[PDB]
Amino acid sequence: GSSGSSGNGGIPHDNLVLIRMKPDENGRFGFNVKGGYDQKMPVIVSRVAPGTPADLCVPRLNEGDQVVLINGRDIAEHTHDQVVLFIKASCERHSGELMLLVRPNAVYDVVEESGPSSG
DSSP, X not given: OOSOOOOOOOOOSSOOEEEEEOOOSSSOOSEEEEEEGGXXXXXXXXXXXXXXXXXXXXXXXXXXXXXXEETTBOTTSSOHHHHHHHHHHHHHXXXXXXXXXXXXXXXXXXXXXXXXXXX
């Protein structure tokens, strides 16, 4: 091991989930989003396909993960078109990775359904 000897940082008080992943050869991901300042609505994942750097990475980006920020940027005042482009931009610069701060969805999930016997 060499070419290192560097380490400094500090996670935010908040306890949100951070997504760590890298762009593909061409620079494309496997996770789609929807919403934005345009629709005065938050940007939440819509669909996630397999064999992608967004489904294999950890923590895996599952449906529902609402993106609060990107690489430490307020992508709230940016319309879909803008946001979509923002993420791509990262590609341009090598030094750096694709980080997405998503908030978890804590909620009890209980289901039950039984049926009698015709007889």
